[PDB]
Amino acid sequence: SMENFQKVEKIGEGTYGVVYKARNKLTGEVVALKKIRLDTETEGVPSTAIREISLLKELNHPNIVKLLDVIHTENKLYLVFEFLHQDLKKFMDASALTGIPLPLIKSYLFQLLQGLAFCHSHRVLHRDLKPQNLLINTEGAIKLADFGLARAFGVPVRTYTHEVVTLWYRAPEILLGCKYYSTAVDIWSLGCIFAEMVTRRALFPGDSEIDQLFRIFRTLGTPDEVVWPGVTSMPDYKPSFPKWARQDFSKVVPPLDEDGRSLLSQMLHYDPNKRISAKAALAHPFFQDVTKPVPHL
Amino acid sequence: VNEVPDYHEDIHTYLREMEVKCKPKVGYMKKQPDITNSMRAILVDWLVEVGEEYKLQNETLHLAVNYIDRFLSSMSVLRGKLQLVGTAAMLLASKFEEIYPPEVAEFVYITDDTYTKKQVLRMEHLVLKVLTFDLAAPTVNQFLTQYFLHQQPANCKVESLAMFLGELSLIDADPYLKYLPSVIAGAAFHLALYTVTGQSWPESLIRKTGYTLESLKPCLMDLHQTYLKAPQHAQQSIREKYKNSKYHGVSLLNPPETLNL
Ligand SMILES: N#CCNS(=O)(=O)c1ccc(Nc2ncc(Br)c(Nc3cccc(F)c3C(N)=O)n2)cc1
């Protein structure tokens, strides 16, 4: 089927492989590709692509990118997705001066929570939530993308890969080297993005693991046994960590209302056992007046 | 919360659906000209040896067996190539489930250079095409790990013996292809519970799954016969694997003479 496509341009590079904007010559459908130069005398089909395809064939949801076809030749591999108009990071950059209106931020967060709740209800961890992987269209919708780092988990989870999350959106339990990690990490990511949507700048733009930890501490206070039981026993925990006091969120996220501050506090909770679930977050009072405004690229 | 409860139910329900779609054809071995159930049992025993050799997860072995069964349901394969299939599947599951999957060279090595790296990669390609990339299949292990949470005070021996029986069910295509993974998991759990503690399939699991002891009875009978005949079975790698203290050596426990069902 791969002679049936006109490459229009290169969009960017994702978790793995190159992404092109292309058009179907027979149906006119505009789609996005994902090209993976496979190889021979190598490891073959990468695990990222395997996981992405296998999991996206199961995840049919309005707020999750629809995978239309997989064109599987012996030399290369092509994934075909619905084409979305923009990613969240360019939209933030274009809005770094005017800002995203509160109704639009609320609608985007609501949709993201719906998608993540679907993913978690289908035993899938995304593990790479960030603005580059959040795509928007001209009709006000937003979708989760690029499950290359995603993986299907099981009931009581076992030890998974540790070197998994974009640094700025990595949950504290990962930075501290906890043995078991779960849905909570994804929630954490959205939290950061939520803040990054209001302030229009990264909440915890760390340049190293320790810097990320220290920024999280300076913003939310250095965790102890009270707020997070067991923190002192984790492998990468140090009692020599500086003890910062918790900042009132009224200073962390100024433009946010009382309900929004409550939701953000529940999303950035230290104890993953305590952190709000996406399903529970959908019922927060913050979303009682939810709408679906238009972004206007 | 590491036993994620807020989405707990949904996941189970979803698996109960998915296990129906990934089911291979029950009588596919009857349509295969060159292979038999015994050859498949030898392949699965070798896969157990491989998983223990590279210290792979049990879920990986279960996924590999599921892939092999689903592939052989629609593709006729000669015996001289059977291992290749069983290799590629074991590779794919390793890429899907394992953090550090063994590299292709190691899989070629464990075949004793029976096949080439090119052959293994091309068989991986073919298996992916045949299975339409539906590799996230529910396993007996995935249901066992959920059934374990309903234990009145948990027992290491019960868990190890249930996992042992679940792995044993993989060897014999006849008759264990008749039963769904959830049913096999329930039967193994009840058998281990009755063997160690004498307790029965708990009410909480009846409410959760909808399976009753009467419904599990046929799988219980088949699995009990398999458990009783295990020492005499031609394939023994699972018993050797479960001799170790890692599974508390539950393989050498005395099975009950009757189930009083
Ligand atoms: N210039 C500029 C900066 N990029 S952008 O904001 O203009 C813009 C980015 C993406 C799209 N469309 C689109 N539709 C479906 C998919 Br699938 C998809 N994939 C990706 C594309 C690029 C990078 C990625 F990481 C992915 C990914 N995560 O897979 N992209 C449109 C505009």
* Domain residue ranges of chain B, discontinuous segments joined by +: 10-23+137-261, 24-136
Helix axes B181-196, B8-21, angle to 10 degrees: 120
State how far Cα A1 lies from the chain centre: 32
The answer on A189 and A129 residing in a single domain is yes
Beta-strand (E) ranges in A40-146?
Answer: 67-72, 76-82, 86-87, 124-125, 134-136, 142-144
Are A125 and A151 contacting, i.e. CB atoms less than 8 angstroms apart? yes
Omega within 30 of 0 (cis) for the link into B175 = yes
Please compute, for residue B230, the number of CA atoms within 13 A of its CA located in the half-sphere on the CB side: 28
Question: Which distant-in-sequence residues (6+ apart) come within 8 Å of A121 by Cβ?
Answer: A279, B7, B10, B11, B14
Is the domain of A63 the same as that of A99?
A: no
Per the CB < 8 A criterion, the answer to whether A227 and A270 are in contact is yes
Q: What own/partner pairs with CB < 8 Å and gap ≥ 24 does B12-17 have?
A: B12/A155, B12/B146, B12/B208, B12/B209, B14/A121, B14/A122, B14/A123, B15/A123, B15/B138, B15/B142, B15/B143, B15/B182, B16/B182, B16/B209
| Cross-strand partners of A72 | A77
Task: Name the residue among A30, A34, A29 with its Cα closest to residue A12.
Answer: A34
Nominal resolution (angstroms): 3.1
Of the candidates A27, A76, A85, A80, the one whose C-alpha atom is nearest the C-alpha of residue A52 is A80
Instruction: Spell B218-239 as b/e; 16+ CB within 10 A means b.
Output: ebbebbbebbeebeeeebebbb
Q: What is the CATH number of the domain that holds A199?
A: 1.10.510.10
Name the residue type at position B236: Q
Same domain, A120 and A243: yes
Within a domain: A293 = no
Residues of B with Cβ-Cβ distance to A43 under 8 angstroms: 103-104
Within an 8 Å CB–CB cutoff, is residue A57 touching chain B?
yes
Residue A296: inside a domain, yes or no? no
Residue A5 identity: F
Query: Shortest CA distance to B90 belongs to which of B64, B115, B67?
Result: B64
Q: Last residue of a domain, which of A65, A82, A99?
A: A82
Residue A294 resides in a domain: no
A163 shares contact with chain B (CB less than 8 Å): no
CB A36 within 8 Å of CB A75: no
Cα separation values, A18 from B31, B74, B184, Å: 43, 34, 43
User: Cβ < 6 Å from ligand 1: which residues?
Assistant: A 11-12, 14, 19, 32, 65, 81, 83-87, 90, 132-133, 135, 145-146
In the structure encoding, which two tokens stand for residue A289, read together? Answer: 């007046």
Distance A81 CA to ligand 1 centre (A): 11
The number of beta carbons lying within 10 Å of the beta carbon of residue A187 is 25
Helix, strand, or coil (residue A294): coil
Domain end call among A82, A117, A144: A82
* Local structure of residue B31 (DSSP, 8 states): G
Identify the domain containing residue A23 by its residue range: 5-82
- For residues A51 and A117, membership in a common domain is answered with no
Written as six digits, the tokens of B108 are 């070629």
Q: In this structure, are A167 and A57 located in the same domain? A: no
Ligand 1 test: best mutation among A8, A9, A10, A11, most atoms within 8 Å of CB? A11
A78 shares a domain with A95: no
* Domain-located, residue A120: yes
How far, in whole angstroms, is CA B145 from its chain's centroid? 13
Q: Are residues A163 and A106 in the same domain?
A: yes
Query: Is residue B28 classed as helix, strand or coil in its secondary structure?
Result: coil
In total, chain A counts a number of residues equal to: 297
Contact B98, A161 (CB under 8 A): no
Q: Which residues lie closer than 8 Å to B119 by C-beta, 6 or more apart? A: B84
Q: Which residue is listed with tokens 């959760």?
A: B208
Give the residue among A203, A197, A202 at the shortest CA–CA distance from A268. Answer: A203
Residues of A catalogued as catalytic: 128
Q: Are B257 and B195 in contact (CB under 8 A)?
A: no
Residues of chain A in contact with residue B136, where contact means CB-CB under 8 angstroms, are 54-55, 58, 152
Q: Between β-strands A67-72 and A30-32, what pairing exists: parallel, antiparallel or unpaired?
A: unpaired
Whether residues A152 and A272 fall in one domain: yes
Interatomic CA distance for residues A279 and A118, integer angstroms: 9
Residues of chain A contacting B146 with CB distance shorter than 8 Å: 155
Query: How many Cα atoms occupy the beta-carbon half-sphere of B56 within 13 Å?
Result: 28
State the alpha helices, DSSP H only, in A72-183. 88-94, 102-121, 172-175
State how far the alpha carbon of A82 is from the alpha carbons of A5, A11, A199, A249, in Å. Answer: 14, 14, 30, 38
B131, two tokens: 């299975």
**Min Cα separation A92/chain B (Å):** 32
Query: Looking at the complex, does the CB of residue B3 fall below 8 Å from at least one CB of chain A?
Result: yes
Check whether residue A77 and residue A134 sit in a common domain: no
Q: How many CB atoms lie within 10 A of CB A116?
A: 28
The secondary element (H helix, E strand) that includes residue A152 is strand A151-152
The answer to whether residues A167 and A273 belong to one domain is yes
What is the CATH classification number for the domain harbouring A39?
Answer: 3.30.200.20
**Annotated binding-site residue numbers of A:** 11-19, 34, 82-84, 87, 130-133, 146
Asked if A137 and A260 sit in the same domain, the reply is yes
Clarify whether residues A38 and A126 are in a common domain.
no
- Domain edge (last residue) among A48, A82, A116: A82
